[PDB]
């Protein structure tokens, strides 16, 4: 390694010493990738060893198996689990690949050349080259596009994906006709993020997801080919800082925005995140409680339509501010929730009274009861329910954990963008160490502001 | 000479102005002034707003039998939920007033204004040849404001759960939040309280030590005094280290308390310790945590008088 005198960076900033050491930086990146893959494999194996297939996944606090199940591995109709071997296979494959990646990282960090700008000119790069950086960006864009097309092929040819909107309970299906229409695909991006619209979190079918992934894979391949054979235009050079920390800051900002989007999507979406694996969402639990109470009261004998509440609005059914028939009570805020177990009861103008009378199947009632029981509410002690509850339950929904953790990570990475962008701009300007003390810019300015 | 745009950008990015109108300023100023104008007009006079969505409004305007302490800009109606509710989407202006549009308008413009204010802080730091990390410190109150006004409504699914823009609204929101989430028992609120108390302590101590050492730039005698006092010699003898610690403590505390707020926004409450100490037979022994639970239970039953209609408060 190095020391402070040679580099100028203290131990608590030691990784900053690798900015101009391509070999060591590459070794560090490879070792970190090996760490990521190792955690993936180890956690997959841990969840497999503790998984009881009889109980639902969301009732055991599993966060990685739901992804593989959504991919459509070892899952039958309604989310029932047939066998758990594919999860074991994925875990062991990630584990061994992580072993290989870790060996590569430790080699490139300890034995490999410190700087590879002259021995391996293809892999060498200067942070201000402005042409090799685009080459690397194009290579990785092509790789990302290949990954997206791999997902598309998995959903289209090799087996299928878990469609939760299939008739009855959802099941594995092949997406024979993905939605490739440009208008439909690009309507999501420009849609408003507020309530009712929800931006890309409003995808409600697997066809749209697969078509969008086709689009993004093709666009990424084309963009990679573009960037390999091109250098940034003068207007691009005019409005960017060309240094390693600047690129790091750009990536930090983008990935923080990605973390926020992931938080919102995990909390709200239930198509790419089936409730049979991740548990019911926030609105889903309340809607399910209202539906179950309405069904029970109607079975006991009552007029659900003519059931005026204490405030006069309506105990069971009322009207939304747009005009649709919705469940009444404090759940009015969740009136735009949509779920496979509730849609068959919806007509052109909201919930249909006639369908609510004699068109409710037993599976819908059972799913509603199960979801209303396991609300996303929880506690830091893994208690469950409202804060004023006894210690009798050990449930916190995986959706809550995912949302909280990824929001925290996104916020910290936005802070990282701020810090690193500011420092990169200052260092490129040249005053990141301090004021000159002999050519101070303020002293040459007109006083009184 | 130079074109129109060159002169315009020279004027905008000029350090000779009394107040720096940065490129972030060009958005900060209109949004902040719009929010200020709407807030002032609504506070002075605005009809009662149906916060609960149950056809009963609450008044928070001075012209409607209120004072400074009890006045507030009532949050958006529950029936609206998270829907965007601009002026042009309402049939009439009075309907916009009734449903609680001004709160949404003020919140949106104010959040944009504070984000651009942080950006402008960075910009003027850059234009004067300074190290640009004042904005990083300023982000902590910005993060707290975003969690209070935006993240919590998103997690709870409605803007009616946000903080009202009024003094009594703050206390009502705090009582509500403690009742529903047990804020006091969360480690992140404890860290925020620790950060605030430590900020006050270090502010007072640093002020006293520096002022006492400014005899007829701090001398080394203050370090010796501090070492003799609390038996922490060499803990802080570098001025840069001391001032960095002063900056770092409260910022980290506020970051963590804002993160705890945003975490509870997604129904991840604090610690639960009721019914923990149990007799040998099986009887439950009360603890101070159980008295806190009793207070929370009392807060919860009178939470919404006529809004709920189901046994469990899932919303």
């Amino acid at each position: 390694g190095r020391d402070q005198e040679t580099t100028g960076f203290a131990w608590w900033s030691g990784n900053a010493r690798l900015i101009n050491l391509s070999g060591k930086l590459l070794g560090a990146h490879v070792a970190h990738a090996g760490l990521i893959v190792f955690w993936a494999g180890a956690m997959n194996l841990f969840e497999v060893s503790h998984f009881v297939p009889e109980k639902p996944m969301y009732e055991q606090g599993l966060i990685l198996l739901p992804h593989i199940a959504t991919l459509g591995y070892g899952v039958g109709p309604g989310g029932e689990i047939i066998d758990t071997f594919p999860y074991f296979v994925s875990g062991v494959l990630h584990l061994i690949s992580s072993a290989v990646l870790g060996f590569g990282g430790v080699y490139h960090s300890l034995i490999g050349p410190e700087t590879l700008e002259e021995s391996y000119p293809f892999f060498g790069y200067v942070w201000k080259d402005k042409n090799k950086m685009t080459n690397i960006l194009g290579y990785h864009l092509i790789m990302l596009g290949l990954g997206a097309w791999l997902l598309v092929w998995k959903a289209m040819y090799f087996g299928g994906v878990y469609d939760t909107w299939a008739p009855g309970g959802g099941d594995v299906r092949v997406i024979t006709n993905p939605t490739t229409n440009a208008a439909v695909i690009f309507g999501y991006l420009v849609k408003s993020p507020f309530g009712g619209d929800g931006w890309i979190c409003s995808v409600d079918n697997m066809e749209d997801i697969i078509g969008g992934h086709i689009w993004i894979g093709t666009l990424e391949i084309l963009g990679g080919i573009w960037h390999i054979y091109t250098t940034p235009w003068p207007w691009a050079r005019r409005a960017f800082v060309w240094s390693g920390e600047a690129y790091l800051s750009y990536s930090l900002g983008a990935i923080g925005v990605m973390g926020f989007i992931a938080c919102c999507m995990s909390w709200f979406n239930n198509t790419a995140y089936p409730s049979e694996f991740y548990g019911p969402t926030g609105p889903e639990a309340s809607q399910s409680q209202a539906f179950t109470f309405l069904v029970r009261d109607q079975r006991l004998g009552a007029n659900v339509a003519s059931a005026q509440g204490p405030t006069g609005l309506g105990k069971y059914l009322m009207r939304s501010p747009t005009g649709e028939i919705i469940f009444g009570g404090e759940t009015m805020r969740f009136w735009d929730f949509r779920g496979p177990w509730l849609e068959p009861l919806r007509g052109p103008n909201g919930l249909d009274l006639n369908k609510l009378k004699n068109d409710i199947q037993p599976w819908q009632e059972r799913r509603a009861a199960e979801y209303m029981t396991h609300a996303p509410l929880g506690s830091l002690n893994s208690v469950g329910g409202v804060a004023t509850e006894i210690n009798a339950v050990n449930f916190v929904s995986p959706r809550s954990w995912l949302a909280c953790s990824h929001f925290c990570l996104g916020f910290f990475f936005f802070i990282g963008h701020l810090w690193h962008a500011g420092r990169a701009r200052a260092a490129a300007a040249g005053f990141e160490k301090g004021i000159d003390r002999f050519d101070e810019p303020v002293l040459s300015m007109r006083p009184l502001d | 000479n130079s074109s129109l745009w060159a002169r315009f950008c020279e004027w905008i990015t000029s350090t000779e102005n009394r107040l720096y109108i940065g490129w972030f300023g060009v958005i900060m100023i209109p949004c902040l002034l719009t929010a200020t104008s709407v807030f002032i007009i609504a506070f002075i006079a605005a009809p009662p707003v149906d916060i609960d969505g149950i056809r009963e409004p609450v008044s928070g305007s001075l012209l409607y039998g209120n004072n400074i302490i009890t006045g507030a800009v009532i949050p958006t109606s529950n029936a609206i939920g998270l829907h965007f509710y601009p002026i042009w989407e309402a049939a009439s202006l009075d309907e916009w007033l009734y449903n609680g549009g001004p709160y949404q308008l003020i919140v949106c413009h104010f959040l944009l204004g504070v984000y651009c204010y942080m950006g402008r802080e960075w910009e003027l730091s850059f234009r004067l040849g300074m190290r640009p990390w004042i904005a990083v410190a300023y982000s902590a109150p910005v993060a707290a404001a975003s969690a209070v006004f935006l993240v919590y409504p998103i997690g709870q699914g409605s803007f009616s759960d946000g903080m009202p823009l009024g003094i009594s609204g703050t206390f009502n929101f705090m009582i509500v939040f403690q009742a529903e989430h047990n804020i006091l028992m969360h480690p992140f609120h404890m860290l925020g309280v620790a950060g605030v108390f430590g900020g006050s302590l270090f502010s007072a101590m640093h002020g006293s030590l520096v002022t006492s050492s400014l005899i007829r730039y701090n001398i080394v005698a203050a370090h010796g005094y501090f070492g003799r006092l609390i038996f922490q010699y060499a803990s802080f003898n570098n001025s840069r280290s001391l001032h960095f610690f002063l900056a770092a403590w409260p910022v980290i505390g506020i970051w963590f308390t804002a993160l705890g707020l945003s975490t509870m926004a997604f129904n991840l409450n604090g610690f639960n310790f009721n019914q923990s100490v149990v007799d040998s037979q099986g009887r439950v022994l009360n603890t101070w945590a159980d008295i806190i639970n009793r207070a929370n239970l009392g807060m919860e039953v009178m939470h919404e008088r006529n809004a709920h209609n189901f046994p469990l408060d899932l919303a």
Binding site: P447, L448 | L62, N67, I68
Partner: peptide
Amino acid sequence: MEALVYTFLLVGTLGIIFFSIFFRDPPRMI
């Protein structure tokens, strides 16, 4: 009546803030 008093107090406070920001004593020899 009381609303007018509150409005006058707030307007006066804002005016004092404006005067302090703009009609300030120029700082010399910082």
